[PDB]
Amino acid sequence: RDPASDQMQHWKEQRAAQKADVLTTGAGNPVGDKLNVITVGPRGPLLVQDVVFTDEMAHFDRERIPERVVHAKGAGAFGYFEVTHDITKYSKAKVFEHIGKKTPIAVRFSTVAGESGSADTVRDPRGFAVKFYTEDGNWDLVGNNTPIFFIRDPILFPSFIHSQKRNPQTHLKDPDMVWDFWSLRPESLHQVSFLFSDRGIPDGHRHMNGYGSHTFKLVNANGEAVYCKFHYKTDQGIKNLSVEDAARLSQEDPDYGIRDLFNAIATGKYPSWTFYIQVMTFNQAETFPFNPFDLTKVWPHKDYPLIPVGKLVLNRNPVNYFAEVEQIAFDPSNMPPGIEASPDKMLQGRLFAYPDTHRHRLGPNYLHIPVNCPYRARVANYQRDGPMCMQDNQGGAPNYYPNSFGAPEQQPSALEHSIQYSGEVRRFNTANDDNVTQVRAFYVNVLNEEQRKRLCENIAGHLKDAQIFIQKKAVKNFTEVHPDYGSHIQALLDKYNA
Amino acid sequence: RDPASDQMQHWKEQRAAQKADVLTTGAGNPVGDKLNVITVGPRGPLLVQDVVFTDEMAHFDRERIPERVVHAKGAGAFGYFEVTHDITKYSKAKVFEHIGKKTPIAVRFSTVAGESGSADTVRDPRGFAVKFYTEDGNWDLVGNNTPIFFIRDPILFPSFIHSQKRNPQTHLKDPDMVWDFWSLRPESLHQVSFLFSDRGIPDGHRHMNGYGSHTFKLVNANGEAVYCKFHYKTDQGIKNLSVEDAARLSQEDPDYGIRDLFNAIATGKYPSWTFYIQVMTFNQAETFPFNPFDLTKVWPHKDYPLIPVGKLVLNRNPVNYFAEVEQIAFDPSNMPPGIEASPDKMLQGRLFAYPDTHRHRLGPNYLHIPVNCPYRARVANYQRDGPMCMQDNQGGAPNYYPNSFGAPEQQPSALEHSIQYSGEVRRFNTANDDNVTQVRAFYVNVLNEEQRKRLCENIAGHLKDAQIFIQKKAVKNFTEVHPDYGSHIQALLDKYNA
Amino acid sequence: RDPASDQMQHWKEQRAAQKADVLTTGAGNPVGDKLNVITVGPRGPLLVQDVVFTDEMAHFDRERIPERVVHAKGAGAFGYFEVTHDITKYSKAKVFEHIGKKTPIAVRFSTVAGESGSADTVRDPRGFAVKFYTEDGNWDLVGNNTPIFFIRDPILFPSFIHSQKRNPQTHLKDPDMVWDFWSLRPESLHQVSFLFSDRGIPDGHRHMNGYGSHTFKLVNANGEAVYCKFHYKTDQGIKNLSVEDAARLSQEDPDYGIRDLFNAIATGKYPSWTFYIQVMTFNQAETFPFNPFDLTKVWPHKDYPLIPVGKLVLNRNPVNYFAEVEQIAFDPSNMPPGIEASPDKMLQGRLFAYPDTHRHRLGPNYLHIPVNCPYRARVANYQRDGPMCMQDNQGGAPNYYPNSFGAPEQQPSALEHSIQYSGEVRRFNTANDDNVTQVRAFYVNVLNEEQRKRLCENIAGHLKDAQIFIQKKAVKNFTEVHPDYGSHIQALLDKYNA
Amino acid sequence: RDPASDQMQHWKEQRAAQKADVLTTGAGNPVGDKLNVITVGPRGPLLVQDVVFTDEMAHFDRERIPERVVHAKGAGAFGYFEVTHDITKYSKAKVFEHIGKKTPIAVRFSTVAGESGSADTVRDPRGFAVKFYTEDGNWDLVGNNTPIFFIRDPILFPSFIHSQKRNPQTHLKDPDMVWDFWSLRPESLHQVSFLFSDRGIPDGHRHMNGYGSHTFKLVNANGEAVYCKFHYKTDQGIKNLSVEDAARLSQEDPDYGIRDLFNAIATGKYPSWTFYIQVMTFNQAETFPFNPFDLTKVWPHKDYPLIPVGKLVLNRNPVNYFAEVEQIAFDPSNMPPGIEASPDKMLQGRLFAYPDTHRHRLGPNYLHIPVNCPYRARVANYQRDGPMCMQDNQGGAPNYYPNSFGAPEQQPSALEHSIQYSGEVRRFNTANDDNVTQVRAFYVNVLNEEQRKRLCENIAGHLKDAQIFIQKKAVKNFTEVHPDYGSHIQALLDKYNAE
């Protein structure tokens, strides 16, 4: 059989010589009997003296934590990131310090809208989160399998999720909400194409690329700053599943990705990704035709060729899923020196959003969990107390800064880059920006005839369920993108409606 | 289209005349703009002054509560319970006070092992929970579609769930755990048959019966007590789905039951159940061949004919799923006067288990939620404070009992029945009780040839994935139940393994 | 006796005619007996069937919520705010709409460092929080009895609290931490004087003034904006307690303020405050000698005379302290239209800090608690779900914005004021600003000889416990403020040390 | 100065050679500057990019956990328990395995009604909780400075606390509630005397005795069982504070006990307690004049002499109060083999009450906190997951029992003692039991004239604030206890009321 199905058996093989441990309660008290409870005779009521039963039932009653609001379904793995090229001119981060340096990494793949028990082989963008354990703390690169996103303004992200999730009343998926939101927000059209192409349903997590959608900032030792885009492309090749195969796998094996990744890692076929960066100077950003910080746009390779950096490899499956995968947290705000945020609005929203939900669902001290703990760095600060504070709470050291008792001191070298920003402080509308030129390029050049036909068919099949005026608005947007695109969509919708 | 898909449209039709409300924050402050955020110019960073954005994102980050440890996937409805016959001789409860009395009820159907996003059309026992709003408080009748259960000892319930759920490491369903637990616990064999028969996959919640598996105690005005079993049988008839149809629906519509129930209630086809009780006297309990409090056994109809009581009808869909279905809590300990627990161990375990998990996942004051609040009874007690205590916290009334300031007083008439229990206080083993006679009767008499063949085929198909020795133990147990049963299972397993 | 001690008796007088209510559980089930538990005979063990006992004990176990990190000890009252003058030229807020308008208000007084059981009559700044229930939501004016504060940078606020609170190891008040922090941060000197003057220990909450320390922004209908400072001065007159009297009251009655306020309101002697505002134009802000947004500085009355607005009156004691005082939350971010924040850094920090701690200690939906609920405004938004979500969760309305189904729409008239800000984005040091001129003015002109002598004596008495070098640094700072001040402090410290 | 006030200085002396550590965020990222925030120019608004500020403020906003519903104010210490005598005939517990065995212990003293910032030198019973780290898990002996308690029925405990705590409306201490509850429940009279005697205000935690109020059950290797009462008496001697001195200390130093204990341990003057047990056989329990499981009664020394066992010593102050004292949890249900509960109702109530509140205020996995973790025992079970589950969550081991994959197995030797209990299952009233004979003995024999006079004066001073009929009922109960007692109380109350 496959290794996963033999997991317990392998465990039994590891402890074949060792004797079974003595059963205990939470406090370590041995248990005389766990197959039966205390009663007043053979057919009497239960008693409170059965402390072991109460402890077991109470802990069983509290095994569930709140699921992630998005990306609930997921798989996890661990490995290393290896540097193969020198980019010290662009950044001063310790991860890129020198060639050959190896940094431990924790990786989690996920699906956006699927809940905890949702199937994996469905049409949905795939989230790809990486956590590097560097000497200067944790670095969280939380991207997707797509270099762009539906929207460019953070405040609309919740509503978008509410559109992609179940109806508040019927608790059913409502295509009307999805297509109404997309039609009212044509900026998503680009991503929509990427969603309904062949890449929408990858054949496992090992056969899909990963992109850092946002543009970040890289600062070198001399203080020079350049904007950057992160990419990581799979070395196993791109492979996609047909719609029929995806439905068959969903009915048969909803956990196709988890099983595939686990068996691949166990058998030694370690997946790998090659890491690239695109670099943009401030002058290029000023002269860029579009807004370089727009999450809906991409940097063309011809103007901004990929620059290799290193390689990602995964070589360890989780020992316990809940401890190492369910409780793992990726905060994009964890950026070490040499890497800083950009004026991209979506990134700014994520910076606040992620730690807040992590504190809510995992706890205020979630960072001290072993999977999220920067075990390669020394954490010394003036944060004290907190629920479930493990360790020694930094002992009896002074808890106020500044102080005259040799407490931790700030490091001036880790300051942030300073930039002059013009314009008045207010709300600027970005819905009228260009939303069709790159989509037109993708439709015309990147895709061949067969891919275009499949794209149109899939979009029509999903959109037939929506109401008429929503279909008309979506077709209008597609026609603005390209006439033949909208005409094909309209013909397919007419066929479905008839 | 179906009503559910038109839900929002119907909402728009209700407020066609009414003007749209003004958008506000949580505190009621009007929002100038929600499509954009505050930045330092067109391409500047985000500011903390955007309080509306922080509020929206913080609330979005906290939309998820812990799912139910079991019965996570579910559907909800509301209606009334109507009395059609007089059983005042058996019980004094206000619900059975007189003929024609109507009591509001809230009903929730669920599947045991399926998580939040799990499909409905799968082979799994169906949970059926009812909450009656009586003048003497809430009555929670929390049964299943089966009158029995796999085990008879509460302390084994968590492990059983751990066997029916994902592997701790791979996060995959492991048939090895399930069949190892069942083989080591042959008492489940009875339920296993009920699980693998045609009833294992009902065609929606409206075409399955509901049973109160435990035996309870009914006390009349004169203090006489009799044990009872609750039943509620569907008036729409029993209908089951084939395995192929179930898989097709799971791949197509994981929410088949929710959609079916919602559309049926919306269109006016209100489902109905007829309510019955079996009655046992204490002398009959003493002379019963088996233990009458064993959850694995049933009371034969011939010796204990069904006695009609009333009828259940559902005629209202939830307005909001999360408020009325996700946050609803059924505590079996909520038993009004005239209904009391039995010495059945499993019921005693549930009595403590349910309120504990409810306090954990919903909050200490979960009972004050409108769906769970006994709005037909006046709650006056000496419980004070608590997180998120709504209402007035009973004002400035005295908070200590006894007192000399006209505070609430106990009602002696609501005392419990007193019974003399013999035997010493210790742990009594119940694994050696009879586990094959009723299973043999069910296999031989109740089931016809086709049902027996389908049962054997389904059991073999599920059990082929397990290891060899587990198969041998399960086949041994089936042979103990009946020779032909085990022989057919063994032949099918040999075919699958070959 | 005083009314408070007769509270229960008065309750008994209100329900003299009414019969005592029937005791019930949380679910409304009547309780047969609450004075005794269920046991196996007179001297047997306890049973799980005693559901009432488990419910009562479980709720008793969960009566405590996390106390406020600061301002834990407090008193509460309710009343109205009445407008007496027209300031529509400065602001467009509904509270100042027209003369004679009355707005419900909830008021809470507190002491900063005192914990829940801490005494009230101690030397500590007094927090004064007001919550106006306006048609445009809640307005939270959260000031103190002092118009300034120790620090001007938000990031130092936690450490300051850690200095004013117990040692991490010994759990004792450490004057070394307090005076080390103050000496290292001479900007606090101003506030320190205000702390050690006669006002440091007010004779109850009714004999102290209240100030809105931060400068806010007022916007009129025409879009013109002006900075403002809020004041509310007591009509009962300023009255202070001697140190000996304060210690005597602390040993006798730690709840002196609560009792005083409760009895005053019950007897009809309603306390009152007169509301004033200072107004600054943008030109004046540019030409102001200091930074007008510095929390350590004040606006002189001669240059910026007080302008009366209205009056505050309290006329209702809490019915339940925990529901109406412990669970009340004041978020400064709740600012209706016409009132906006300033570039003061401390205010910006508070804007994020307060709702976060409120969500932590009260819950994500704390705003829906009746005391904090804007019952005079209609809350319509796209926030859904959440733990312990009461009401109907906005029903089945659309949960995504924008939408085409008549959902709530934004109000453009409630937009924020736009201002051009110059300078580069970085961290600017503010520790070198002026810290002695206003302190010198306060020491020389405002205070008479007796007040100066008492100030020096109190400061020396508190500072004698600190180490020598801390005393030298503090004396150096005082000498920088004024020579005689430091000389008197040094002489007193020499006397104490000798 | 005293060591406590020099604490930080001593810390500075320990790291005099070591260089200051680099300041970091929660994730370990170095902080460029912590004295200032990011703004749009010198006088601009705050930005979200200041992640360090948001992290610090968010953690500061979440430094407070729910305080204990009772015994909020407290002090903590650590040390060892040493066996000096052999009682293996009575119990088989590993702590009493052999003479000279030393077991780590964590001790917490507390005051019942005082909140977190409440003063220590007040008239209130003192809670004394001990946690032994034995090879067979944790043993929690959670007693008080008194061998008895006000009530004997668990269901009345919350109301009693509600009487001893602030009014729901005024948030003030109400003597009316306290004395109404005590008068309606005369069974508390015994404890009331113990509360209003000189022992009501001990001169620190080092000068008071500690008692295990409940009667427990001790089982030996051969299965024989005997009931027991635990005692631990201070070796420093009993010392009490006068009312005037107590008020003076409360106004001056509310943390008198904490400071005293910390300085005593730091200076080397380690406090000590001698451990004793009273033993009762089942026949003696049957023939006992009262109910031996009544928490309101005591076992006379003459009939049941004290039997020494060992000694308790404290020799380590907490490194961090919050981690080691605020988050410490004592569950009486943590009883290793050889020690079992009795049919005492109050103990049965505590067994369920304590872990529930601990799960509420500390978290479902509070037992894995280092102070509460049985680091001297191996915890292997089928409990999985849970919020903030540290360690490895027992790895990928099987999570269902029984199983055929070499998972942890039960130990039959750790079974509980079996006893036949007679009588029908119902609610039995215990309010009519004897409530005056032992109180009369305590008033007449144990106390001298001066102690009796001070007791009467203190009771009258507290009770004068109550309403008239409450005073009459309390005086009636005292007269039932003894005539002169009630007469003195009535005369003092008349004097106070006439004022």
Ligand code: HEM
């Ligand atoms: C303003 C825009 C966004 C917001 C507010 C947001 C919010 C969130 C939240 C609240 C979570 C829950 C994480 C947890 O509970 O552990 C999450 C997870 C995640 N998000 Fe986003 N999201 C946004 C856009 C994006 C973008 C643009 C990407 C990638 C290009 C992305 C990729 C992910 C991934 C991969 C996860 C998985 C986290 C994990 O596995 O622990 N999201 N996001």
